[PDB]
């Protein structure tokens, strides 16, 4: 499932991301846009044997278990497959853990490069 910008905004707001750890809804929407193009089925293979999964491209070295990432730690206590669902509940729960890990949303490289220090409220225009 690939979300539309407003459909994702509503889902993320329903699941408590607006102003979570001080990050407005637009930040989260922007991050999803650049991390995955709103695609819950997105996967990206990395050189270390990890993969980034889902709409917020959560990494399998640290956060979820994909059964094939050497040295993986599974801090969200989930199989990575639950991050490939249309239902973003598990992705949001894990994202809340990631954003609380000491660097805010800088954990998402695409957010840092493309969203941070921009006017992110445009991501919720018309929603
Ligand atoms: Cl916003």
Numbering used by the authors: 1 to 127
In the authors' words:
These findings have been verified by our structures of DEL-I and DEL-III. DEL-I and DEL-II also bound HyHEL10 with a similar affinity, which represented at least a three orders-of-magnitude decrease compared with HEL.
The duck egg lysozyme structures have the basic fold of the C-type lysozyme characteristic of HEL. In general, the duck isoforms contain approximately 20 amino-acid substitutions (of 129 positions) relative to the chicken enzyme, and were thus considered to be likely to maintain essentially the same fold.
